[PDB]
Amino acid sequence: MSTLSNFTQTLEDVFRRIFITYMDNWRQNTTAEQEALQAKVDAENFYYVILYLMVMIGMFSFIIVAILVSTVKSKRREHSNDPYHQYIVEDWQEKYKSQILNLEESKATIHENIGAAGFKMSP
Known part of the structure; x- marks a missing residue:
């Protein structure tokens, strides 16, 4: 469970x-x-109107391009099979070690907090 x-x-x-x-x-x-x-x-003030235009057409153009590529690639309709970095298992064992290292770093970071007040009760 x-x-x-x-x-x-x-x-x-x-x-x-x-x-x-x-x-x-x-x-x-x-x-x-x-x-x-x-x-x-903005002391320039002129930039406020200039910047507004930058995002004006820039945004409108992005949309047109967004569909152009999507509509263009859409005609690709690909459905094949390709091998992916099968070595992903070997490279993982390398990064897997970082986890153990991070754990050690946490102890140093965690102990810092207790430093603010790490004194339970006396016997």
Whole structure:
């Protein structure tokens, strides 16, 4: 019995609220960053209109190209079979070692927190 699978279903519901809420809270603290930036606004002003055009046509062109390539490649309709880096198993054993190394680093990072107050009760 892996309660981890049953609990995962619940985590998604909370993460959903925390994510939507997390993204929401950020918008509140983000203001502070804007308040300081708004103080610098734009003395040129002319750039505000110039930059607006850059994203104007740039966005419209991106869409046209997006479908052009999608519609163009769509005519490709390819369905074959090609071998993928089969050595993915050998290269993995190399990165697999990094995990063990990271674990050691965590101990040093975890102990740091306890430094703030690592003194249970005296005997």
